Design a protein around this ligand. Structure first.
Ligand SMILES: Cc1cccc(CNC(=O)[C@@H]2CCCN2C(=O)[C@H](N)Cc2ccccc2)c1
Ligand code: NA
Ligand code: NA
Lengths: 251, 28, 11
């Protein structure tokens, strides 16, 4: 996260760390959406241009974390993957369209002050909250700058950006399965996700029920916190049917 | 789940985090 | 590798 702040303890209890077994390293961010399902970005698990194609056995899920590098004894819980599900039309070849995957845990994790699921938006929350100007929040253990590693979970509030501004900011073809967030160069304030923040949650606090919803997944950006550039997030609601379907069918 | 999005150390205790107000203010 | 060792159990 660039230009963010340290997370408060318990501020993001849905925050998950995708961790590589060997060599032990952070691979990505992710979110807890129930006691057995973790939401992440497709490209965290599969991205042939970088020779990335992770299998279940390659990974651990670390839930409840604060520190980036520490084993947080009695606090974090490390989970094993039973199954990973990538969107069948995840477009890794061109623009990361539909950049979303589910990970089923082997055993359920136990909720706690530090471990708790985020909601997934319904059409009405999406419609009400996914508006230009409305701010969401993004968290991750990724890089502090484009060119670095944070000691604790980083947090940044970023305004959703107008779709045409999004489109005019890049040569990449953007889709309805994406939205962009970030300040405009003259809004002064800045901040963005960066490398290692991938698959982490863009969340918003609904003012109607006071509940945190995950509207986005950290998906892609060109550089990090570059002026006139915006972070791109997987539009979670738009892919919700796939989410429910995968969860309903496989449990 | 049914308790989703309510954080044990903030919403469940009626405590707020330091910057969630900033989001509220933007939901204009 | 700058990560503290996790219990060997987790794998
Ligand atoms: C919001 C945000 C900001 C900065 C990095 C990220 C992490 N996302 C990434 O690093 C991903 C993975 C492949 C390249 N990519 C990127 O963000 C690329 N820099 C741009 C791109 C977009 C689509 C297709 C190919 C390349 C996310
Ligand atoms: Na463009
Ligand atoms: Na920017």
């Amino acid at each position: 996260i660039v230009e963010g702040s340290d997370a408060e303890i318990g501020m993001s209890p849905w925050q998950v760390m995708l961790f590589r077994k060997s060599p032990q390293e952070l691979l990505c961010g992710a979110s807890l959406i129930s006691d057995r399902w973790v939401l992440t970005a497709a490209h965290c698990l599969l991205y042939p241009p970088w020779d990335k194609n992770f299998t279940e056995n390659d990974l651990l899920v670390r839930i409840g974390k604060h520190s980036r590098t520490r084993y947080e004894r009695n606090i974090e819980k490390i989970s094993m993957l039973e199954k990973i599900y990538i969107h069948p039309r995840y477009n890794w070849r061109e623009n990361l369209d539909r950049d979303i995957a589910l990970m089923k845990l082997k055993k359920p994790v136990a909720f706690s002050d530090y471990i708790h699921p985020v909601c997934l938006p319904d059409r009405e929350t999406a419609a009400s909250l996914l508006q230009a100007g409305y701010k969401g929040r993004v968290t991750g253990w990724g890089n502090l700058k484009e060119t670095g590693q944070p000691s604790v979970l980083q947090v940044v509030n970023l305004p959703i950006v107008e779709r045409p501004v999004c489109k005019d900011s890049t040569r990449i073809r953007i889709t309805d399965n994406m939205f962009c967030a970030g300040y405009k160069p003259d809004e002064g304030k800045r901040g963005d996700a960066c490398e290692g923040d991938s698959g982490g949650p863009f969340v918003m606090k609904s003012p109607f029920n006071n509940r945190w919803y995950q509207m986005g997944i950290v998906s892609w950006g060109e550089g990090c916190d570059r002026d006139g550039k915006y972070g791109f997030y997987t539009h979670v609601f738009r892919l919700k049917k796939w989410i429910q379907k995968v969860i309903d069918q496989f449990g | 789940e049914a308790d989703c999005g309510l954080r044990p150390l903030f919403e469940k205790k009626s405590l707020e985090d330091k910057t969630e107000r900033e989001l509220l203010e933007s939901y204009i | 590798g700058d990560f503290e060792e996790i219990p060997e159990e987790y794998l």
